Amino acid sequence: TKKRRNNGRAKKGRGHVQPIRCTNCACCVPKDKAIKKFVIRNIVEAAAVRDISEVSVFDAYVLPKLYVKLHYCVSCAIHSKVVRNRSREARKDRTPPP
């Protein structure tokens, strides 16, 4: 039986979308279908923002962040626990989780 209205993916009036490669695996996945997750992330977490800022030649030097748009294979994503299975009620929730 038809599980999703939007057949997993997000194309409505296309017919074809360019595929991307899942990052964990490397499997050809349609762009709209893929679980895209954008990650801004400090080059050092907490243990080193203490130590590196102390040895900062500078005075009041902000650190850079690392900007990587991850794509994911549906298997890629669920094994990596990015997306969980939800109840047939809670499948219809599209709001990104708090």
Binding site: T23, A26, I43, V44, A48, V57, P64
Partner: protein, 136 residues
Amino acid sequence: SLGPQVAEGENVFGVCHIFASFNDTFVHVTDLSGKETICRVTGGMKVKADRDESSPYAAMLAAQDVAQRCKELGITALHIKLRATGGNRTKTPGPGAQSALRALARSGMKIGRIEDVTPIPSDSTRRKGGRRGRRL
């Protein structure tokens, strides 16, 4: 092995190209140019096992041996050009990244501009693994 620098005030800068892939970590200090090298030691040099070439310890222990050698040659400070594998493969730097930075800062050196120089492309050649990818 002496950069004849003005007693204290001068920080003599290098640049440690930290290439942290997911099965090795390279700490490699050069001049401001990049065209002349000072010291390279990688994770796999300082561990007797292929398993822990990637390791954050290996990266730490290499970065310490970099710092040791860079004290001698009269480099006070470094700039950091952190690098992941890049191209059609991952943009994310492996687990040796943080430990290496933390290490060489923690183990003597002074730190200038950190930035990512991970090789990224407009559109790539086809990635390793098939249609269906790396099935396991």
